[PDB]
């Protein structure tokens, strides 16, 4: 069986809670992000500085490539952190130099280490040059 996807993780009280808290503070949160909408593939497990994390993903319905969300849930359901990545609809140089046109938004006040973790996950995309 596949690891749980974003919506399935949010079905558990613990994760739903850390998820809600994650938005405490930020404003103008996109609706698709807020409601955890869109395509999502099975989450993955990883450890950072001795702490287990569960990494989930989602993207905007029908505009998946240019609008993605990566979420790092602390294993001890103590907190969650997110990274929203926006790309422009310029299928030219953006297609080969994504990072050069990408806009990033952080949720949950992630530490430098957690930020590194999330960026590395984004960069794992075969097409992220």
């Amino acid at each position: 069986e596949e690891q749980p996807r974003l919506f399935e993780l949010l079905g558990q009280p613990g994760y739903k809670a850390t998820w809600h808290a994650m938005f405490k503070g930020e404003s103008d949160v996109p609706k698709w992000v807020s409601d955890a909408s869109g395509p999502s593939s099975p989450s993955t497990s990883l450890s950072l500085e001795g702490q287990p994390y569960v990494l989930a993903n989602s993207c905007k319905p029908h505009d998946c490539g240019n609008n993605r969300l990566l979420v790092a849930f602390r294993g001890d359901k103590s907190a969650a952190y997110g990274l929203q990545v926006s790309l422009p609809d310029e299928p030219a140089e953006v297609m080969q130099t994504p990072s050069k046109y990408a806009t990033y938004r952080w949720y949950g006040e992630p530490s430098r280490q957690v930020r590194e973790l999330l960026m590395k996950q984004l960069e794992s995309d075969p097409n992220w040059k």
Binding site: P39, H62, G65, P126
Partner: protein, 129 residues
């Protein structure tokens, strides 16, 4: 599995999607990017109450069966899980049925609104297929 842009273009070509129903290979790659960011394991709980599966986000209300969608017609005669494979054969076969159903690629609202009428060759330009 998250396909590389050219990697997918090549796979779709091998499966005879290039020029299928009058649609050039670029159209298919463009659609897949907006719909799933080339992720074979992505699933989305759509606005119609069913679930979209795979690289081309094919729904469980009309095309595949997941056993959880009332009134399912399974027009592709396949389980939705087959649409999550690293091997895109099942997704291409169903896509061919969808595009031959009478409305071409307009069946994919993402293609209709984001790919139709654009320089779709741009999605394969540089792959040297």
């Amino acid at each position: 599995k998250v396909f590389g842009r050219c990697e997918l273009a090549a796979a779709m070509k091998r499966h005879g999607l290039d020029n299928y129903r009058g649609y050039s290979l670029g159209n298919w790659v463009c659609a897949a990017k907006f719909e799933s960011n080339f992720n074979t394991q992505a699933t989305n709980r759509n606005t119609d109450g069913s679930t979209d599966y795979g690289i081309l986000q094919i729904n469980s209300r009309w095309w595949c069966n997941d056993g959880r969608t009332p009134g399912s017609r399974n027009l592709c005669n396949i389980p939705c899980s087959a649409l999550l494979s690293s091997d895109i054969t099942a997704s291409v076969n169903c896509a061919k049925k969808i595009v031959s159903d009478g409305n071409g690629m307009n069946a994919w609202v993402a293609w209709r609104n984001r790919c139709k009428g654009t320089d779709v060759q741009a999605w394969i330009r540089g792959c040297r297929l």
